[PDB]
Every structure is written in C-alpha cells, then in structure tokens.
From a paper:
[name] is an ADP-ribosyltransferase that resides within the vault ribonucleoprotein organelle. [name] is an ADP-ribosyltransferase that uses NAD+ as a substrate to synthesize ADP-ribose modifications on molecules. The [name]-homology region of [name] includes a BRCT fold, a WGR domain, and the catalytic (CAT) domain. However, PARP3 and [name] contain the catalytic triad H-Y-E but are considered MARylation enzymes, indicating that other structural features are important determinants of catalytic output.
We reasoned that the bound EB47 molecule could potentially influence the positioning of the HD relative to the ART, thus we sought a [name] CAT structure with no compound in the active site. Crystals of the [name] catalytic domain alone diffracted to 4.2 Å and belonged to space group P212121 with eight molecules in the asymmetric unit. The refined structure has a crystallographic R/RFREE of 0.277/0.331. Despite the modest resolution, the structure clearly indicated that [name] HD adopts a similar orientation relative to the ART regardless of active site occupancy. The HD conformation was consistently open in all copies of the CAT domain within the two crystal types (10 copies total). Since these copies occupy different crystal environments, we deem it unlikely that the open HD conformation is a product of crystallization. Here, we have determined crystal structures of the [name] catalytic region that indicate that [name] indeed contains an HD domain, but the HD conformation is quite distinct from [name] and biochemical analysis indicates a more ‘open’ [name] ART active site relative to [name]. In the collection of [name] structures determined in this study, the N-terminal helix adopts several conformations relative to the rest of the HD/ART folds, suggesting that it is flexibly attached to the catalytic domain. In contrast to [name], the [name] catalytic domain was clearly active, consistent with the structural observation of an open and accessible active site.
Residue numbers in the entry: 242 to 361, 368 to 460, 469 to 568
C-alpha cells in the first residue's frame, strides 16, 4: 500500500553498510563533544537554539572591543550577564573578563552550534553525515595499516609503549581541491589535538587560531614529525579513553629554520611558506624543545588519517 512502500524505502535508505569501528568512533567524538559541554553547562545543549548562539557571539565582540577601549568592569558585568542568560554556565562565574575568557566563550559557542546542527534519521548516521567527510576503516591485515603505523613509529624521542588501536582514512570534500598541491615540500606530519575538538576539525578542517594581544610561532596550525611531542597535545578521552591524532599532508614548502621564538607572526615570514621550530639538539641553541612545523593558511593542510591510540596510563 502507499505508506508501506515508503517505510520499505526508509529501511533500505537508512541501512548504510558502515563499519562498526567508524560507528563507534563517530559515536565517541560526538558523545565526547557533548560531554565537554555538559561539564560546565546548567541548561542541556538540546534546549539551546541557533538564535541564542548567534546572539552570544555578538555580545562577545562588543566585550572584546570594550576591554581594548579600557572600560570599567561594572559595564563588562552587565553585558556578560546577558551572555550568561542565553548560555547558562555553572560553578564560579568568571568575574574578571579578559581576552582569554572571551576566546574560550567563543569556542564553547562554536561547539554548541555544531551540536544543534547534528540533532534532528538515526543518531549514528546523522552524526556521520553532519561531519560531511569520508571516514573509512582500515584492517590490520592490510599492508596500508603497517605503512601508517611505521610512519607514526619512527621519530620517537620518548620511549613509552605506543598502542596503535584503530586507524581510519579521512579526507574533506572541499579541502582536497583547494589544497595547495602545486606548492613544494608536500610531506605528512602529525597534528596533536584533544578528542572533544575532533568533531569540529572533521567538519570545518584545521582553522587558524584567533589572535590574542599559547603558540610560540604565532597564530598558525602547529604540527610535529615526532609522536612523543604530539602526546602532550592530545590528552586522553573521557568517553572511551583513547587519544586521537590527525596525520595530514602539510604543504610547508620553503621553511624557515628559526631558533628564536616569534609570537607576532599572524602569517608566515617573508620569502618562506612555513616555520620549523628546530628542536633542541646536541649543541644548537634553540628555545624550541619539540619539533614544530607551522603554516598560516587553511589550504596548506590536507588531512589523511586519524590515529586512535592509548598510553599506558
């Protein structure tokens, strides 16, 4: 009958042959993201609307400019109270509004924005579709797995047991075409990141940090050739309890092997396309401890793999 053929299509349409490892990975990151929000939110995230988020972000812009202007705190409070009414927090209420606070508030909003988009169509598939990216599982039997494992396990300064559990292929749609392949020195590197932020990274890609008048080579996208250095970036997850890490074909081309730090770099130095923090080596004076490759463009990156791993602890 009419309604039955419809539901027959629904079961067929919704039955997307997907690997269970991807499903569990997708379910984790979105549960992890939700977990980070509910760690410091009174109001559930589902109750929050798109309107409140747009408003929230708007209020911050005024508060940001107000601090640089040099207003009294009294005025900052009343503005921020309206912000907190749209997005309720819990615990102590930051009473001191600084550049740093606003940056974190902005990040929180952006996560909440994503959580509203995904929530609408099962919960598993909707979360996959929301990323708008092709995530595939790779078997251990395949020889691709051994390549990726080895590329990870080469530059290992620290000697902690590395448990490479799950490896997934990944690649954004609009990134691949826009990626600067023609630019020279296209080598893969490791990007350390917390599990909570992954949902956003898979959606929008690696974006440039908002400048603050944390990084020692300016506001750019940081990478490393070493894994041990990336462990300090990528903390363990809350939901599953496993570190995630993105391997990306970073086109760094000409790279300046700087010894000294430089925080004023909004973009790359003149004549070169990247900056290489030169790690502290037998007898060469560098402030940089870790190997830090940095680019200052969204289209100088192309993510390839996602490494699910865990430390002894």
């Amino acid at each position: 009958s009419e309604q039955l053929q419809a539901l027959l299509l629904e079961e067929v349409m919704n039955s997307s042959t997907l690997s269970q490892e991807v499903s569990d990975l997708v379910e984790m990151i979105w549960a992890e993201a939700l977990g980070h929000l509910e760690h410091m939110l009174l109001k559930p995230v589902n109750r929050i609307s798109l309107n409140d988020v747009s408003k929230a972000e708007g209020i911050l812009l005024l508060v940001k400019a107000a601090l640089k202007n040099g207003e009294t705190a009294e005025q900052l409070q009343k503005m921020m109270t309206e912000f907190y009414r749209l997005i309720p927090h819990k615990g102590t209420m930051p009473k001191e509004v600084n550049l740093g606070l606003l940056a974190k508030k902005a990040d929180l909003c952006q996560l909440i924005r994503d959580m509203v988009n995904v929530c609408e169509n099962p919960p598993s598939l909707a979360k996959y579709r929301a990323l708008r990216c092709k995530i595939e599982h790779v078997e251990q039997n395949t020889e691709e797995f051994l390549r990726v494992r080895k590329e990870v396990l080469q530059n290992h300064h620290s000697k902690s047991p590395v448990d490479v559990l799950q490896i997934f292929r990944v690649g954004r749609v609009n990134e691949t075409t826009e990626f600067l392949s023609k630019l020279g020195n296209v080598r893969p590197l490791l990007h350390g990141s917390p599990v909570q932020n992954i949902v956003g990274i898979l959606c929008r890609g690696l974006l440039l940090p908002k400048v603050v008048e944390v990084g020692n080579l300016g506001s750019g996208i940081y990478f490393s050739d070493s894994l041990s250095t990336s462990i300090k970036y990528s903390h363990p997850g809350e939901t599953d309890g496993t570190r995630l890490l993105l391997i990306c074909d970073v086109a760094l081309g000409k790279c300046m092997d700087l010894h000294e730090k430089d925080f004023s770099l909004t973009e790359a130095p003149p004549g070169y396309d990247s900056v290489h923090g030169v790690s502290q080596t037998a007898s060469v004076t560098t402030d940089f401890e870790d190997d830090e490759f940095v680019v200052y463009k969204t289209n100088q990156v192309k993510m390839k793999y996602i490494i699910k791993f865990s430390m002894p602890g």
